Structures are given as structure tokens and as C-alpha cells.
Amino acid sequence: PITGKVTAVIGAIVDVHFEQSELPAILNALEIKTPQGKLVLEVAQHLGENTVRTIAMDGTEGLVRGEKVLDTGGPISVPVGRETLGRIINVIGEPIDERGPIKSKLRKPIHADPPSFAEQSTSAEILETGIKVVDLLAPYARGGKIGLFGGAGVGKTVFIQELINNIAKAHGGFSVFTGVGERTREGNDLYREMKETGVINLEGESKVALVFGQMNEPPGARARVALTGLTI
Amino acid sequence: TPITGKVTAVIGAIVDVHFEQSELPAILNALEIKTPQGKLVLEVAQHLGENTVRTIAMDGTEGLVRGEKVLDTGGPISVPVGRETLGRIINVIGEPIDERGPIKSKLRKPIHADPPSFAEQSTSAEILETGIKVVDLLAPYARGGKIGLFGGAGVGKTVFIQELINNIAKAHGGFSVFTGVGERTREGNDLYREMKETGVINLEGESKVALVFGQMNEPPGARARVALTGLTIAEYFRDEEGQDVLLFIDNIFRFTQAGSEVSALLGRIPSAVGYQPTLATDMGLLQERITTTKKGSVTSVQAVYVPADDLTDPAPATTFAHLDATTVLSRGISELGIYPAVDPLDSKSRLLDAAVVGQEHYDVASKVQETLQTYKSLQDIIAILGMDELSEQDKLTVERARKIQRFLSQPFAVAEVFTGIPGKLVRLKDTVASFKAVLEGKYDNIPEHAFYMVGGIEDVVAKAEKLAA
Amino acid sequence: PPPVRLFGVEGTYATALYQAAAKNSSIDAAFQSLQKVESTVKKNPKLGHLLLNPALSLKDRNSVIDAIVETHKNLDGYVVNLLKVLSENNRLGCFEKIASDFGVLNDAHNGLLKGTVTSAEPLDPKSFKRIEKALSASKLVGQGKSLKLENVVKPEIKGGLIVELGDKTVDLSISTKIQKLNKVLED
Amino acid sequence: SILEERIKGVSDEANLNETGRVLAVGDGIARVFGLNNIQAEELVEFSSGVKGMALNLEPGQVGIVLFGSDRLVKEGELVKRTGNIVDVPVG
Numbered sequence: 001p002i003t004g005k006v007t008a009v010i011g012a013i014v015d016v017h018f019e020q021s022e023l024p025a026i027l028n029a030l031e032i033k034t035p036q037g038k039l040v041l042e043v044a045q046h047l048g049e050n051t052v053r054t055i056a057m058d059g060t061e062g063l064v065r066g067e068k069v070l071d072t073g074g075p076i077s078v079p080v081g082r083e084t085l086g087r088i089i090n091v092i093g094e095p096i097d098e099r100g101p102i103k104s105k106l107r108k109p110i111h112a113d114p115p116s117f118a119e120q121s122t123s124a125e126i127l128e129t130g131i132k133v134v135d136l137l138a139p140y141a142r143g144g145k146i147g148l149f150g151g152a153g154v155g156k157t158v159f160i161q162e163l164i165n166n167i168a169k170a171h172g173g174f175s176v177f178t179g180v181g182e183r184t185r186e187g188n189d190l191y192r193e194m195k196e197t198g199v200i201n202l203e204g205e206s207k208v209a210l211v212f213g214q215m216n217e218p219p220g221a222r223a224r225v226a227l228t229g230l231t232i
Numbered sequence: 233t234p235i236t237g238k239v240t241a242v243i244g245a246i247v248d249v250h251f252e253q254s255e256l257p258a259i260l261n262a263l264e265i266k267t268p269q270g271k272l273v274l275e276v277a278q279h280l281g282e283n284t285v286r287t288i289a290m291d292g293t294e295g296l297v298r299g300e301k302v303l304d305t306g307g308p309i310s311v312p313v314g315r316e317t318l319g320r321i322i323n324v325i326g327e328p329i330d331e332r333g334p335i336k337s338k339l340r341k342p343i344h345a346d347p348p349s350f351a352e353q354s355t356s357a358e359i360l361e362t363g364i365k366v367v368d369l370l371a372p373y374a375r376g377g378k379i380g381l382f383g384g385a386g387v388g389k390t391v392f393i394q395e396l397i398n399n400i401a402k403a404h405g406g407f408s409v410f411t412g413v414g415e416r417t418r419e420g421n422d423l424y425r426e427m428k429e430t431g432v433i434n435l436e437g438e439s440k441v442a443l444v445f446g447q448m449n450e451p452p453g454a455r456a457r458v459a460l461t462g463l464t465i466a467e468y469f470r471d472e473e474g475q476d477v478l479l480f481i482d483n484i485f486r487f488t489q490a491g492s493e494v495s496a497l498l499g500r501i502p503s504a505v506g507y508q509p510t511l512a513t514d515m516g517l518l519q520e521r522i523t524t525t526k527k528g529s530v531t532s533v534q535a536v537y538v539p540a541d542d543l544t545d546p547a548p549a550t551t552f553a554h555l556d557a558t559t560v561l562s563r564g565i566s567e568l569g570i571y572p573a574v575d576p577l578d579s580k581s582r583l584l585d586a587a588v589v590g591q592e593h594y595d596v597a598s599k600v601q602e603t604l605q606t607y608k609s610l611q612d613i614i615a616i617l618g619m620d621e622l623s624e625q626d627k628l629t630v631e632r633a634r635k636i637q638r639f640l641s642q643p644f645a646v647a648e649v650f651t652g653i654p655g656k657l658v659r660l661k662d663t664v665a666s667f668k669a670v671l672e673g674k675y676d677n678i679p680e681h682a683f684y685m686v687g688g689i690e691d692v693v694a695k696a697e698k699l700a701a
Numbered sequence: 702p703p704p705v706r707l708f709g710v711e712g713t714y715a716t717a718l719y720q721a722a723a724k725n726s727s728i729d730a731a732f733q734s735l736q737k738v739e740s741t742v743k744k745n746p747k748l749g750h751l752l753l754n755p756a757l758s759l760k761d762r763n764s765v766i767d768a769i770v771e772t773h774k775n776l777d778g779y780v781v782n783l784l785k786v787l788s789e790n791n792r793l794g795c796f797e798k799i800a801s802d803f804g805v806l807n808d809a810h811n812g813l814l815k816g817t818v819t820s821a822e823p824l825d826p827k828s829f830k831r832i833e834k835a836l837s838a839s840k841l842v843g844q845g846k847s848l849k850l851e852n853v854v855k856p857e858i859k860g861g862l863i864v865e866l867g868d869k870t871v872d873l874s875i876s877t878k879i880q881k882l883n884k885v886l887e888d
Numbered sequence: 889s890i891l892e893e894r895i896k897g898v899s900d901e902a903n904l905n906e907t908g909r910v911l912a913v914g915d916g917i918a919r920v921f922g923l924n925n926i927q928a929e930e931l932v933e934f935s936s937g938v939k940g941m942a943l944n945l946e947p948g949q950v951g952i953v954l955f956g957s958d959r960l961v962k963e964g965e966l967v968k969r970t971g972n973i974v975d976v977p978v979g
Contacts, residue, residue, distance in 0.1 A: 020759070025959065026914065026959050046913050113957070241947050294928055294973060295928055295929065748892070751903065756922075768892075
């Protein structure tokens with residue numbers, strides 16, 4: 001496939017000059033093989049003159065202007081499956097849980113177009129939740145957006161855990177706890193807690209799949225973490 | 233002059249032409265691009281060199297094809313003036329948009345006209361009484377003056393002007409110019425109908441009023457030169473006819489605003505809040521083309537849409553500078569339900585003086601100001617703790633001031649529909665008397681509701697009887 | 702060092718060309734050959750006009766350059782390096798611009814004074830000659846640079862004449878005198 | 889000559905009167921080369937399969953505004969004029 005040489009590294013905005021006429025499309029994912037494994041850059045402009053402008057998903061520290069870039073060909077494709085249940089995956093869709101390569105069926109682009117007007121369901125329903133207070137005074141709704149308020153550690157986390165338990169009874173569904181710029185110390189605790197409360201059973205089954213965003217991750221990867229989770 | 237060109241750019245309504253011959257029109261010349269939309273009138277505003285001017289387009293620019301043939305009309309746009317204007321609504325170009333066909337032209341005059349000189353100035357001293365109590369009491373107008381209004385536009389602002397037209401312009405008689413920059417088309421139609429009804433426009437006969445109307449639908453660029461056009465019509469009356477005129481401008485915020493829109497496109501480094509750097513000059517030039525020369529005296533009424541009702545905004549601020557009297561009307565006073573909603577501590581006139589309206593008037597006004605300012609001063613204390621926890625002496629003041637506040641409302645006959653109360657105009661002599669009595673607490677012994685939404689002191693006395701039943 | 706820097710944008714290119722060809726020693730040869738290829742670029746009307754406007758690749762641009770050096774095998778090598786520069790900077794829209802500028806630098810190096818005697822109508826040849834004589838007589842001519850007298854027709858400059866050369870002009874047009882007369886007689 | 893022929897050979901052909909080829913594109917506006925006759929506020933349809941309204945007609949370039957997601961458009965695609973000022977079916 002097409003290859004191109006890095007022609008700028010101003011901040012985390014890395015401009016790559018690609019061989020003529022055959023240029024990535026907007027929202028493609030590029031992989032620069034690095035001694036850090038790979039660096040995933042996502043094409044967010046065409047600057048013209050067979051050059052693009054991309055954002056980075058991994059830190060750009062060290063990079064010789066002129067390193068080869070390879071174009072994956074589309075938005076990052078992250079594995080999905082019942083396999084991905086109970087797996088911590090970083091933004092580039094790779095296991096960071098260190099439970100080794102996640103066996104994948106299919107992988108899917110992180111950017112996706114919202115369902116059509118036709119595909120929208122025309123009547124809303126009520127999602128059951130075990131908490132009586134919730135089910136009386138502010139019922140959960142099927143496919144709704146329910147916005148939590150009140151700081152973490154009040155039991156906020158425990159409330160979230162409760163919902164997973166409830167979900168297992170309610171549907172027997174799955175969940176994905178997507179953490180956007182989660183405090184990484186706190187994240188370790190959360191993983192440990194989720195293991196402990198058995199919503200993740202390493203040996204057993206796991207309802208929740210984890211996508212954890214660390215504040216040390218580049219801003220671009222912080223931004224795309226949510227979209228990745230949504231794909232799952 | 234027939235100077236062919238091609239349209240190099242069409243960046244908004246700021247087309248750029250590139251003349252191919254080395255004869256190049258000067259700045260403020262006018263060009264016509266002929267299209268199946270007829271002529272579009274553009275005005276040269278920059279010379280960018282290499283035989284490429286950049287022109288403001290005073291008509292909509294949708295559909296233009298680049299490279300389109302241009303022809304230069306040459307010089308500033310020349311409107312047609314006369315007394316034949318009276319009984320016409322004219323577009324920016326000068327087209328008779330009231331569709332009374334071609335205006336019988338005498339002299340057609342350039343839109344841009346240099347403001348008359350320092351020597352030509354003639355200072356006013358006339359009293360013009362509107363019979364509006366708040367106006368009369370607080371800040372008397374004068375013939376030839378520049379009158380000013382501030383607040384939300386056509387939220388009562390338009391109504392205020394309409395009341396002024398109803399009062400002043402029949403008494404004044406003679407030529408009068410109404411120029412409405414970016415006004416609501418329906419409101420303009422109402423004005424046209426109303427004017428025809430009140431015979432000021434009598435289309436069967438003659439009209440002693442002329443009208444220029446620029447709708448707010450008109451492209452921003454068009455709106456910029458609506459004002460200049462109107463001023464030319466006024467100048468013909470001021471100068472050539474030499475008979476005292478009237479002028480209405482609503483809103484002159486639209487003039488500033490229009491300039492700010494074009495400014496960005498033109499390529500100017502934006503000044504604070506985003507206003508055009510040429511804001512001071514453009515406003516200045518405009519406001520010195522409205523003046524009372526020894527040739528003639530033109531009473532002008534200018535309406536300022538204050539954005540977000542922040543007077544600190546630079547465009548309203550620089551407007552405040554060029555007015556001779558202002559009567560800022562405040563949303564708060566509107567909430568208090570007082571129509572007219574003129575803020576009484578934010579009005580001024582250079583005509584309020586103890587020489588100009590005499591010591592007795594001035595004394596009456598002084599006391600009103602002091603009383604109301606005290607009332608404003610104690611607003612904090614009133615809210616935090618009851619009025620009963622104010623000093624007894626102060627409580628008299630507070631009670632008086634509450635009455636003064638209610639008293640100041642004067643039902644308006646133009647607002648008769650809205651108020652549902654038949655309007656009343658009270659004499660200047662009567663106004664001074666009425667307030668004098670109230671200030672001496674003569675009629676302070678009857679409810680605040682008695683003073684509320686009613687006219688003169690005699691009317692209040694009667695309204696006490698009405699309430700008493 | 703060039704014979705007085707003139708032109709920033711595009712003229713740094715011209716300056717470079719000049720000084721580089723001063724180190725080539727042959728500036729006249731360079732200029733002449735550039736003039737010849739520039740002329741055949743202009744006298745190439747299909748794509749020598751319609752591909753003076755970038756819209757095509759760096760590689761495609763390079764291949765246009767390759768066609769250009771087939772068109773003349775005389776172009777020195779410094780102006781062939783100039784072709785490289787323009788292709789690399791992918792700016793073809795200032796090729797004739799650079800040509801004109803190089804002409805200015807070149808004829809400054811040659812030393813030819815430039816001038817024009819704009820008038821309302823083309824002047825007499827006796828007038829031309831008398832003016833040519835006068836200008837050479839004047840201290841304006843350093844005896845090192847020999848005027849160009851270009852008549853321009855400008856009826857807008859109603860009558861009279863205006864002589865121009867150097868940064869020094871004498872304007873004894875009729876239009877200016879009328880303008881001043883009128884203006885002061887409006888005072 | 890043969891040189892001119894070879895130049896003709898590497899030229900994409902068409903003077904791009906009423907069609908363009910897209911240049912730098914991103915931030916939902918594209919800058920197109922050609923579209924020599926272009927009506928102002930016209931509707932153009934890209935070969936991308938999206939339509940845009942020409943907003944800025946500038947000397948030598950036209951700046952379309954993309955009515956649709958940026959993913960669809962890619963550089964160097966051929967823009968054909970709808971030929972109509974933006975219209976919507978009414979009735």
C-alpha cells in the first residue's frame with residue numbers, strides 16, 4: 001500500500017507527504033512503525049500537494065522527519081466479539097490488560113455514521129433498574145441518556161457496578177465502561193474492584209468490557225477513546 | 233464611463249472587478265453589472281491596483297458568474313430629488329418602490345456629499361414641545377436638534393417614534409423625510425398605510441412627506457447606503473428648498489452594523505467587539521451631514537438599537553457622542569410597565585437649562601431628579617430590609633418617589649391599541665404645574681394606582697374619584 | 702551583491718539568479734537564453750499558456766520542465782537550475798515575472814536608464830530627440846546609463862507633458878495646471 | 889512540436905469550464921480548480937457523491953462548502969456543476 005515520509009512534526013500534528021495521487025481519505029488511520037511498536041496517526045485534513053495533516057494517538061516524542069508511514073486505509077478497526085468482554089483495550093484497540101492477543105471475529109472502523117431516521121425506533125420504552133428510587137422518580141429509558149451527577153467515591157463507582165449487576169438480571173446484556181481521561185491510579189482500583197465484585201471474572205465471564213483512557217494519553221487519543229467504545 | 237471589466241471575485245457582496253483598460257474609475261464611483269436581474273449597482277471602495285478595484289455591491293450578488301462583463305456608471309450614485317420625492321417610497325438605488333412609476337426628476341444628486349462647514353453652522357435655541365410629559369419635564373427637544381433613543385428596537389422603540397410623528401409632524405408641517413434603515417417590512421407597510429390615512433401622504437393630492445425605506449431583508453451592503461441616500465433627499469430640502477424639514481432614522485445602529493459586516497469582507501483588521509475601524513469616521517461623517525445650517529434647520533430623530541442593551545458597546549457609545557439630546561429608554565423601566573419607558577436618570581438635553589427653560593422649570597426638574605436618585609439609592613436597602621426599616625423622613629421621600637414613578641406614565645394615542653387607554657397630550661405649561669404640585673405633596677394623599685397609567689394632574693384627581701368609587 | 706535590490710517576492714529569486722550568474726560571469730548569456738525560452742513559452746500557446754497555472758503534480762511539473770529543456774538545449778545550466786527551483790517551489794505563475802525582474806537587474810547591470818515621457822498624444826520626433834538630448838545633457842544621465850524614452854498616450858493627462866526617469870519627474874501637464882488653477886480659484 | 893505534443897500528453901485535458909478538480913480539502917470547505925463558469929451560490933455535485941454550495945468565488949479558485957460529512961470527499965475529485973442555484977423541490 002501507499003507510503004509516505006513525515007514532513008513535519010509540529011506538536012502532535014504530524015504532516016505526512018504521500019506518494020502522488022494515491023492519498024488517504026479523511027478519517028483514515030495511518031500506522032508509523034516505531035520502536036514504540038506502532039504510532040497510529042489519523043488523517044484529519046488534506047493539506048494538498050500530496051500531503052495530509054493527521055493527529056496522533058500515541059506520543060510523538062522522537063520521530064525523524066522522513067520516516068515511512070503506512071496507510072491502514074480507514075478509521076482504526078478495533079476487534080469486537082464476546083471475546084472483547086472483560087478486556088482492557090487502549091485507543092489503538094490493542095489489549096493493555098496483558099491477557100494477550102484478543103481473539104477477534106471481526107474488527108470495525110471507529111468512525112461510523114449514526115442510524116437513519118427510518119432506523120430510529122418511533123416509541124420509547126422504560127429500561128428497568130433494580131434501584132427503586134431510580135425506577136420511580138427518574139425511570140431509566142430504553143436507549144436513553146441518563147446523566148450522573150455527584151463525585152466519584154461517594155459510591156458513584158458502586159452505583160455503576162450495581163447497574164452492571166442489574167443489567168445481567170434485566171437483559172443479561174453486556175456493558176462497556178469507557179473511561180475518558182480516567183485518573184490512572186483510580187483506574188487500577190476500578191479494575192481491581194470490577195474483578196473483585198465479579199462483574200469481571202478473569203476465569204469466568206465478564207459483562208463489562210473495559211476501555212480505559214489515561215490522562216497521559218495524547219489529547220487526540222482522549223477524544224477518540226469514546227468513539228472506539230461506542231463501536232464496541 | 234463605459235469601462236469594461238470582468239468579475240475577478242465574488243467574495244460575498246463585495247465583488248472585485250478587473251478593468252482591462254488603463255482608464256480606472258475613482259473611489260466611490262458606481263458600476264452597473266447588467267444581468268437578467270437587471271442592473272446590480274456596485275460602488276468602488278478600494279483600488280487594489282493592477283487595474284483591479286474592489287467594489288461594495290449594493291444589490292444581491294447571488295447568481296453572478298465570474299468574469300461577467302461590468303460597465304462603470306461613473307461617480308457616486310445619483311438619486312433624484314425635488315419636491316417630486318414627496319409621495320414616494322424609494323429604494324437605495326432610487327427606484328420608486330411604491331410603484332407610482334418614474335419620479336419626475338429635477339436634479340439628481342450624488343449620494344456622497346461633503347458635510348457643510350464650520351462657518352455654515354447655525355446653533356439652535358428653539359423649544360420643541362412634544363406634549364409627552366416625560367420628554368417635556370426631563371429633556372425638552374428643540375427644532376433643528378438631534379434627538380436620540382436607545383434600547384430594544386421596535387419593542388416600543390418604533391412606537392415611540394410613531395408617537396413623535398403623530399405629534400410633531402402635523403404641527404410642524406412642511407417637508408419631512410422618513411428614512412428607515414433595515415426596518416421590518418410589515419411595520420413599514422403599516423407606516424405607509426397610516427401615513428396615507430393621516431393624509432400626510434395624500435397620494436390623490438400632494439404629500440408633504442417623502443419616504444425612503446430599506447427593509448431588513450435588504451442585503452447588508454444595500455443597507456449601508458440607505459442612510460446616505462436619505463440624507464441626500466434631506467439636503468435638497470435643507471439647502472435648495474431652504475424650508476425646515478424633519479428627519480427620522482431608525483435605526484442608526486443598522487448603519488453602523490451594516491458597516492461592520494462589510495468591513496470584515498473588505499479586509500480590515502477587526503477593531504474591538506468586531507466593529508469596523510472606520511466606525512468613528514463613518515458615523516462622524518454621517519452625523520455631520522445631518523445638521524442645522526444657516527441654510528436650513530432639520531430636526532432629526534435617531535433610533536439606536538443597543539445590542540444586548542449594553543451602552544458600553546462601542547457602537548452605541550460613539551453614537552451617544554454625536555447626539556444633541558438623548559432619552560435612553562431602559563428595559564428595566566419597561567418591566568416596571570411604564571410606557572413611555574424612558575429611564576429618567578439617563579436622559580439629557582443641552583436644552584435643559586435654567587436659562588433655556590427658565591429657573592422655575594429647572595427647579596421643578598432638579599427636585600424630580602433628586603427625589604428619583606434617592607429612590608434609586610435606597611433600592612438596595614429596600615430589598616434587603618423592609619421600607620419600614622428606613623428612616624421616617626426617607627419614607628416620605630420613598631412614597632413620593634413611588635408616586636412620581638407612577639405619575640410619569642402618559643398613555644399614548646398611537647399606543648392606544650396596545651395600552652387600551654386613550655392617549656393624552658399634556659401642555660408644557662401644564663406639565664411644569666402638574667409636577668410642581670406633586671413635588672409639594674399637594675395631591676400626595678391618594679393611591680399610587682391613581683397615578684398609574686394616567687395623564688395630567690387634573691386627570692389624576694379625577695382618577696382618584698374613579699378609584700374611590 | 703545585485704545592482705540594487707528591487708522586488709522582494711519573486712525578486713529574491715531574481716536576485717539569486719543575478720548573483721549566481723555573476724559568479725557564472727555570463728549574465729548576458731543567461732538572460733538572452735532565458736529570454737529565448739521565455740519567448741517560446743509565450744509563443745507556445747497551448748499549455749504554454751494553459752499550463753502556466755499549477756493544478757498538476759510535482760512529478761508532472763518536472764516532466765513539463767523536461768519538455769522545456771528539450772525545446773532549447775541552450776539555456777545555460779544556471780537557468781536550468783532556475784527551472785529546477787521553480788518546479789520544486791511549484792511556482793510557474795511567476796516565471797515571466799522572474800523573467801521581467803531579471804531583465805531589470807540585467808539591464809541595470811548593462812546600465813540603461815529607463816524613462817517615459819507620458820503625454821496626451823504622441824509627440825513630435827523633433828520633440829523626442831530634443832528631450833533625448835536634454836535628458837542626456839542633464840545630470841540625471843550619469844553617462845553610464847542611457848535613457849529609454851517611451852511615449853505614453855494619456856488623454857486623461859489633458860495636454861502638456863510629463864517627463865519621468867529615475868525617481869525624478871517634471872510634470873508640466875495641462876491637467877495639473879488646470880487642476881491647481883481651478884482649486885485655488887475655488888479659494 | 890514534439891515537446892508540445894508531450895506536454896499535451898501529460899495534460900489532463902479540458903479547460904475545466906463548468907467542471908473542476910478538487911485541491912486542498914478539509915474543515916468542510918474545499919478549494920477547487922476550474923469551474924470556469926460557475927454561478928454564485930450554485931449547487932455543485934462532487935464525484936464523491938455529495939453536493940455543496942459554492943460560497944467564495946475567488947480569482948482562480950472556488951471554495952465549495954460541503955453539505956455532508958468530510959469523509960466522503962477526498963482530494964483531486966471531479967466536481968460537476970448542478971448548474972442551478974440551490975433549489976429544493978416545492979409543490
